[PDB]
Amino acid sequence: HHHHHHMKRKGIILAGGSGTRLHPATLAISKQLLPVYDKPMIYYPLSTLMLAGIREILIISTPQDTPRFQQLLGDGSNWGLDLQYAVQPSPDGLAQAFLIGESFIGNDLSALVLGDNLYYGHDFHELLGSASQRQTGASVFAYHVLDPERYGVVEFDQGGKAISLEEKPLEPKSNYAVTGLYFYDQQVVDIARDLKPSPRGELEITDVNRAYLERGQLSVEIMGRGYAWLDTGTHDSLLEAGQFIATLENRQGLKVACPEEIAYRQKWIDAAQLEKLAAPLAKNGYGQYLKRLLTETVY
Amino acid sequence: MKRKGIILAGGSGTRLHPATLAISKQLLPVYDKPMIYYPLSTLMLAGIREILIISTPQDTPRFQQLLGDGSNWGLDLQYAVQPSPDGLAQAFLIGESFIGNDLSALVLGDNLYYGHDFHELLGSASQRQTGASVFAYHVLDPERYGVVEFDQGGKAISLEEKPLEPKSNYAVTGLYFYDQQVVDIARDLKPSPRGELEITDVNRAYLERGQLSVEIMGRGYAWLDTGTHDSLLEAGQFIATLENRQGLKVACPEEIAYRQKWIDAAQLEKLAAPLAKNGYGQYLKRLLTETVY
Amino acid sequence: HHHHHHMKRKGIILAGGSGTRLHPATLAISKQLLPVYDKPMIYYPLSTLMLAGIREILIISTPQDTPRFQQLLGDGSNWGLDLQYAVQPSPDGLAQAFLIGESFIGNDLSALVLGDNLYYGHDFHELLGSASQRQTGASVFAYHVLDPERYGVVEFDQGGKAISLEEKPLEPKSNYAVTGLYFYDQQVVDIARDLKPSPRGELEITDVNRAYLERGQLSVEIMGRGYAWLDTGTHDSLLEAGQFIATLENRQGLKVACPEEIAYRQKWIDAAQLEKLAAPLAKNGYGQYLKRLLTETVY
Amino acid sequence: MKRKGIILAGGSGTRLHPATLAISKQLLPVYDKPMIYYPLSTLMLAGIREILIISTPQDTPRFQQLLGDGSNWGLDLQYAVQPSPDGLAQAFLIGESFIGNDLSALVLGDNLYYGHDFHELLGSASQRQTGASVFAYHVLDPERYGVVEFDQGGKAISLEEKPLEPKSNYAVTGLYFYDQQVVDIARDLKPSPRGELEITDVNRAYLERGQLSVEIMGRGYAWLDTGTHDSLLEAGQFIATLENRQGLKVACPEEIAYRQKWIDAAQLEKLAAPLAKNGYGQYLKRLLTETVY
């Protein structure tokens, strides 16, 4: 039948099971509900989507922990967002987010973020706003790491054009890992639907990204060394991520990934709404921070 | 007589929100294990195997999920709820039937202890069949705690809960040993000016009869609580620095049960199987074949 | 007499005494020779000047420690720089750098950096290159901090124009501290010469900066929250600075403030020279890093 | 008999360059004090007051500048040089005349110890008038150290220096107590395959005569060395976490001398005056008026 034709990019946060890998620390709750310093891990990637201008977001978690994500985040209305929830019964891979979120996505552009990925740096807002406005094809970010063999790895020719993607290569072609933030057009769900599980039994995001690469529709932007991309893969790196955020925040007196703040700066909530969000947290440093935001100009 | 143990793992209010909005503090990790493994380990090192875990209505089921009935670790665990955070002394009313006619010990669910001959420092408090024993520890900010005053001869003469003008820098730690008198003392407590049933009031009751032993926990011991986001990060880094230097874990309950002969080599072997692919299971398997002094 | 008229901006690092403040840790050596993680503190501000394109640099230290700075840094030729040395017998204030360095500066533009100031962030190269190219007036950077009362503080009108500078105000007009990096034109030495000591007995850089402000020649650029400006004011912040750098470097496998690297990327030294600098450090991670730089493209 | 002490604070080569290019590692800070305060404090806690400090030619004058003749702290300090890093056992040749006919103890200038009843753990090694005493400690990477093998009954039967295939995870720490035999044993040592005079060879010489006491330093003690940039940062954070929690310092030599009665309240008062405006002087002044148990 006939369709008609007349900002809308939707977001997805994958906040499912980290299996048994960080057990026993994660036996009683999801990794993405563990705090990084002063706030739940999931505030960080949520803030990343918000900085990209995305207000309609699906959170994918396990059946066991969806209610706790719901208690924490609600339907998003407090922060000028709309948050929806979906469950992932079995951790069958990151590309399953698109099958799980098919109805949520509809006919729109989308972005996927890993619920345990934290980014920090300058003009991040601008770096994200950019990729979001590129409507067709896919956009990813490559970042120089010490251990590229743990990641999807991008190979570049001498001109600096991406020419290949390999998932966890034993002999990486570069030290450039693909980060856990992905922007996609309307082709992604069909590409995902045609994926066959890898030898590990999982539906691989690198296969989605390779599909765009083969079509000549993959933009790979370098996220330079002056950005911090932390993930919380080990107990040791989770501790480092906490110390990192604590050092920045205690130095600056400004928070990284405060959603109330980001919504306020985006004009998604007003001063009066922000004041209401501060009232219940007024006795701790978090509510006090929100209060101070109403009476200060921050450039 | 036998001594039963109680871990109070109740609500920290809104103090660490939003980090703790979703889940209680004592279910969160300190480095590589849930915070509550640490006080549980403290009780186990005092030789206590019958333990009641008290937490909020919402999270008691989740402590139950995490720890089970304890039989996998040669423990006997029971659970109870504290409907509202109305004071630490409520532990003895909530746990009155659990305690029965036995000796007891209470540990706070967010207290972490590290040091040498702990097994021995606890055993000597555990051995007193009469009176109460507590530990005093020199801190920078005594006003946050129950504060003990000593006379010139080193005798404890007063306790004040969160004084505006502390008499010393010696705070009472969150580990308490009691005789058969504590339930009856807790039953006669009146709420304090802050609307709480105070553990310090209990301790003062023993002090007034000359039945409070106040042992000094020396500077060569580490007492950490997880009261702020900053100190929480400090506790994790501390445990990480010790464990990665030594190749030995602090407060691994499976290891402690095994060393106490509460489980045998074959039970530990079974416990190691689920986490065989990660560091924790690998650690437990290694405990089967290594002599550690 | 008649003068004639036909990149040349010179740099100065103040690396003098921190008094007794960090004693006893600084009894046996200068604070600016203490390592921050894996390299001496002074590598960081030196790298900052290098990133600004400055190759001619004066290091001001105490008589006691100048030889150790000389042993460490030499005359700069190894790194495509020229380094000169001057002593500050008594810690009489930061603005004394211009009287001490008067002959070094000559008729040129200049930049002053504090030897204990560390900066990290994206397009820092570009942010510095910018200020260096502004030839007339002065350029400074303002950064939101938790404790502005410890610093020179800048006040802005509602339009965002700087209107006042106050040195360590008990009641700061904003949370914007002036950072320890300063770019000056040819007027600075005369302004410094006319300074009278403050009540603390010191020649204040904020008085120099106010002089430019009163003339309408002070540019104050915001260094945003996605940049890290760390100083090493306390034992606690020195520890945090070390952990910060260690987390970035171990994540990325790239160093912050490696002068050999920066000189190589600036074309001030070639591959063969870099190879020679790596030979003596070949057994440790530092020399190994320098070696890897010859065989890798880093964007 | 009296026991003299030696701190070996010599060169770490190019291993931590460029951090240590300008100055030796043991002059750098661990948190708030120079690294060498920590082993000095260890000797002082073992009751040792006559101490020889051995370092590189370049930096001995700077240890002399930092520490003086020790009389301000009720110590008797002397200095000597190790012209080249030719093995720890060189300490006893360099210090032969210093030692004379007395008992001795050697500590490495970059070893940091923390734990309870250290004063007591050292005093019991200090009391042996015959033989040698060392401490073994469970580590993750024993191949970096002198490694001790035990039989089934817990007896030390072998030592290997940096084995490719360690017999256990028990490393010998950098603190050694010796009787009058050590100089003569060191004098007969031959350089090892690595061109070093080995402390492990000295220790094996005592072991062969059944005169090596190998005490276990338990897991409740922290032994830190500052061998890598990473571990250096871990040592500082560890000391910071303890000191800021307790309001008490680890390895403050002025305090240790005062508690040992080597200086009096009036001497400490004078020592506090120079740094009165910072935390360290404020700490020392506070020690005059506070009972710390």
Ligand SMILES: CCNc1c(N)n(Cc2ccccc2)c(=O)[nH]c1=O
């Ligand atoms: C640099 C870290 N990112 C970040 C930024 N940039 N901002 C400023 C900002 C948010 C949204 C719209 C305009 C400005 C925050 O408030 N919180 C943040 O966490």
Ligand SMILES: CCNc1c(N)n(Cc2ccccc2)c(=O)[nH]c1=O
């Ligand atoms: C280092 C803190 N304490 C501790 C000790 N001491 N032990 C040894 C031990 C446990 C039970 C019976 C005998 C010996 C552990 O296994 N785990 C520990 O956490």
Ligand SMILES: CCNc1c(N)n(Cc2ccccc2)c(=O)[nH]c1=O
């Ligand atoms: C982001 C931290 N700054 C930094 C940067 N940007 N670079 C890249 C660079 C240096 C000079 C010219 C072009 C590129 C380093 O090599 N070391 C650094 O420390």
Ligand SMILES: CCNc1c(N)n(Cc2ccccc2)c(=O)[nH]c1=O
């Ligand atoms: C915590 C490590 N040990 C330590 C101890 N034990 N003491 C107490 C003490 C010193 C000398 C004689 C009697 C008592 C310190 O003053 N500083 C210390 O660093």
Ligand SMILES: [Cl-]
């Ligand atoms: Cl920014």
Ligand SMILES: [Cl-]
């Ligand atoms: Cl002690």
Ligand SMILES: [Cl-]
């Ligand atoms: Cl960058």
Ligand SMILES: [Cl-]
């Ligand atoms: Cl122990």
